[PDB]
Ligand SMILES: *[C@@H]1O[C@H](CO)[C@@H](O[C@@H]2O[C@H](CO)[C@@H](O[C@@H]3O[C@H](CO)[C@@H](O)[C@H](O)[C@@H]3O)[C@H](O)[C@H]2NC(C)=O)[C@H](O)[C@H]1NC(C)=O
Ligand SMILES: *[C@@H]1O[C@H](CO)[C@@H](O[C@@H]2O[C@H](CO)[C@@H](O)[C@H](O)[C@H]2NC(C)=O)[C@H](O)[C@H]1NC(C)=O
Ligand SMILES: *[C@@H]1O[C@H](CO)[C@@H](O[C@@H]2O[C@H](CO)[C@@H](O)[C@H](O)[C@H]2NC(C)=O)[C@H](O)[C@H]1NC(C)=O
Ligand SMILES: *[C@@H]1O[C@H](CO)[C@@H](O[C@@H]2O[C@H](CO)[C@@H](O)[C@H](O)[C@H]2NC(C)=O)[C@H](O)[C@H]1NC(C)=O
Ligand SMILES: *[C@@H]1O[C@H](CO)[C@@H](O[C@@H]2O[C@H](CO)[C@@H](O)[C@H](O)[C@H]2NC(C)=O)[C@H](O)[C@H]1NC(C)=O
Ligand SMILES: *[C@@H]1O[C@H](CO)[C@@H](O[C@@H]2O[C@H](CO)[C@@H](O)[C@H](O)[C@H]2NC(C)=O)[C@H](O)[C@H]1NC(C)=O
Ligand SMILES: *[C@@H]1O[C@H](CO)[C@@H](O)[C@H](O)[C@H]1NC(C)=O
Ligand SMILES: *[C@@H]1O[C@H](CO)[C@@H](O)[C@H](O)[C@H]1NC(C)=O
Ligand SMILES: *[C@@H]1O[C@H](CO)[C@@H](O)[C@H](O)[C@H]1NC(C)=O
Ligand SMILES: *[C@@H]1O[C@H](CO)[C@@H](O)[C@H](O)[C@H]1NC(C)=O
């Protein structure tokens with residue numbers, strides 16, 4: 001849901017005149033507040049993989065086999081690295 | 093020329109624009125059942141619009157991935173050590189500044205002037221209720237500064253070697269010496285004048301920020317991409333007051349005064365008139381995306397060649413002779429800081445093509461022949477540093493009759509005294 | 511899409527042109543025919559505009575491919591990352607349907623080593639700078655190498671050139687320079 005809180009979804013979509021099947025995608029236990037709306041139905045992991053399905057604002061999603069479920073995560077820019085610098089040292 | 097100058101210049105380039113989406117039924121009919129049932133015997137002029145708009149939207153992320161994700165090893169800014177006398181403080185990120193962006197980027201983000209559904213319940217809510225939505229970009233403003241701080245921290249540590257393989261460290265002075273040697277001048281010119289060049293660079297960096305602090309029309313290209321994408325969406329909503337030959341422009345004053353057979357003649361005029369506005373909007377967006385794409389490709393080439401290397405192409409990376417560049421991120425764009433070497437106060441001299449010693453013609457290996465009135469020296473062409481004509485500054489070819497302006501002088505054998 | 515767009519009645523009574531001409535007389539039919547005509551011209555115009563817009567991208571890709579053929583295949587480019595990743599050696603073209611495929615050959619440096627470096631050498635009152643490579647040390651001796659491949663040599667007067675004295679260069683070290691013709 002694009003620009004709503006995760007506690008105003010029931011009132012913004014009128015989640016009382018909808019079918020009971022549509023009313024499972026407006027409740028808790030899986031709500032996740034991204035910066036691009038509210039995401040419902042995806043399990044939030046704390047790792048960082050490559051982007052599979054771009055959601056937005058730095059959040060991607062994929063279909064993993066933890067049995068199977070949709071997980072949302074924060075994309076990683078790359079592999080961290082550092083270079084040893086000094087004023088009398090080269091590498092050839 | 094006898095002296096030089098270090099000059100830092102600025103270039104600004106758009107990379108991307110806003111991503112939008114349009115709901116056909118909500119814009120045309122607007123939660124009406126008499127309409128949107130008449131807008132079903134019309135054709136497929138609503139899937140073909142959202143194909144084009146999605147093709148536009150998903151390309152603005154490739155635009156950014158091309159420019160900024162050049163290298164995917166996030167090098168870390170080393171604790172600022174001595175760089176020979178150079179002070180990269182205003183461009184390297186500060187720990188305390190918001191979103192770990194540098195001083196110059198903080199200056200740049202303020203100049204360019206870019207709502208929860210709980211607040212709409214102005215002109216943004218008027219276009220949100222009519223189906224027009226603005227999507228968010230994939231790569232946030234904190235993920236671009238981290239790419240830029242790695243592009244800018246690999247190049248002041250390793251040099252040109254991290255855009256061609258593994259990063260190999262090298263002292264900064266011994267990197268600027270090779271960069272000098274790549275434009276014609278020699279190493280001793282830098283190694284003997286290091287403090288002056290460091291001071292010139294540090295005093296040239298401290299003028300860009302002063303320019304950016306008292307000039308409103310600095311980022312003029314990056315504001316005209318955010319003005320037009322708002323003007324279009326504001327015109328698309330003002331276009332809902334037009335009755336394209338119908339009795340009224342309001343759809344609830346036609347359905348409350350006429351019965352279906354007499355109303356379908358006005359509804360079918362409003363539908364036809366409101367599809368044309370959407371088609372015009374889509375065509376203009378398709379036309380502007382093709383310019384933003386070209387600017388993104390130019391910025392990607394400029395990032396690859398001016399920042400990750402050193403270009404010989406004239407006026408491609410500034411004015412003068414190119415030494416290095418540093419990137420900074422601006423909203424919906426990129427800013428390059430080019431460093432160039434400009435020759436300075438020069439002098440007149442008398443020149444010759446060759447030297448006729450005793451029946452031979454000596455030509456210079458690298459420089460030119462000059463005279464201070466009564467003596468002849470050999471210099472390098474981009475900096476006055478005279479020497480003595482010997483057999484290891486020149487080479488012999490032919491005799492003294494084919495060369496037109498050949499003069500007579502002496503060439504000193506280096507090993508003859510011994 | 512241009513053919514599926516023929517099932518639309520743009521406000522007319524029907525989308526089939528033979529069910530309007532078989533049920534209405536000309537004065538009553540020209541009002542529906544003139545709606546179908548107007549609606550079927552718009553689809554052609556949209557198609558033409560979109561084709562004109564896509565041709566302008568295909569043209570840009572063709573120009574890029576022509577420049578890349580001229581510079582990567584018929585020569586050797588110094589432009590970075592224009593003809594691959596690394597340092598460019600050569601390229602070979604292959605033809606693909608509606609396109610082109612370039613095979614770029616590049617030289618990538620490999621397993622590297624650490625060394626201690628200096629800007630200049632102070633022999634006896636002079637400062638020697640290297641002609642091509644860099645000065646390195648294996649801990650106790652000083653050599654001159656080329657910067658893109660470790661191949662050490664001996665510091666002589668035909669690897670270096672003299673300029674100035676040993677006070678302006680910041681990190682100058684002291685060593686010896688071997689005269690090549692002094693033994694003779
Ligand atoms: C090449 O040009 C540079 C300028 O780009 C010359 O450097 C300048 O040298 C002069 C004289 O040494 C400096 O003037 C000094 O100013 C200070 C006050 O700032 C004063 O206390 C000193 O007594 C003196 O008047 C000038 O500031 C300095 N400029 C820079 C940026 O360092 C350089 O001498 C020229 N070299 C040749 C070969 O002509
Ligand atoms: C690099 O330049 C910056 C910006 O000028 C220096 O930071 C400050 O500079 C001003 C004037 O140069 C001083 O008054 C401040 O004391 C400096 N420090 C602070 C608190 O920001 C910075 O010191 C320079 N770096 C070096 C190595 O001298
Ligand atoms: C051209 O340069 C030469 C070389 O520097 C000058 O020759 C010197 O002139 C001075 C005059 O006081 C003598 O003391 C030096 O011994 C001369 N040679 C050396 C070794 O520098 C020559 O005079 C210059 N000509 C002009 C007109 O400036
Ligand atoms: C440069 O040197 C040549 C000799 O290599 C000079 O040429 C001679 O000029 C005279 C007339 O002045 C002739 O009689 C000789 O035959 C020429 N050649 C010989 C064999 O010496 C030439 O004049 C010199 N030019 C100058 C003085 O700038
Ligand atoms: C640095 O390299 C020099 C030159 O190769 C080494 O000097 C040699 O050391 C070996 C030790 O067994 C001697 O047998 C050789 O005679 C030495 N010189 C020659 C001609 O190769 C020096 O030891 C090296 N230093 C280190 C620490 O590796
Ligand atoms: C490198 O060589 C210079 C000489 O060219 C050494 O400089 C001398 O240092 C001593 C003090 O250690 C002074 O008393 C002398 O006046 C200096 N110059 C002379 C004329 O010898 C310098 O120390 C050497 N550096 C080293 C050992 O790496
Ligand atoms: C809406 O979300 C914000 C944080 O995004 C929170 O501060 C606010 O209390 C929420 N509103 C509610 C829970 O009514
Ligand atoms: C992710 O981190 C947060 C904060 O520590 C924690 O509350 C949450 O349980 C973590 N989730 C996972 C997948 O471990
Ligand atoms: C060189 O000579 C020209 C013509 O005699 C003169 O105009 C100029 O001022 C001189 N000095 C220069 C170019 O530095
Ligand atoms: C330069 O031109 C003058 C005038 O024609 C002539 O006398 C002189 O010989 C020329 N010098 C050269 C080196 O061509």
Ligand SMILES: *[C@@H]1O[C@H](CO)[C@@H](O)[C@H](O)[C@H]1NC(C)=O
Pocket residue numbers: 084091622623624
């Ligand atoms: C060179 O030295 C650095 C720092 O001491 C070290 O991390 C690296 O493994 C060494 N060897 C290389 C770069 O081949």
Ligand SMILES: *[C@@H]1O[C@H](CO)[C@@H](O)[C@H](O)[C@H]1NC(C)=O
Pocket residue numbers: 087088680681682
């Ligand atoms: C390198 O830095 C160290 C630490 O400041 C200093 O002692 C040393 O003299 C420097 N060497 C050169 C060649 O600048």
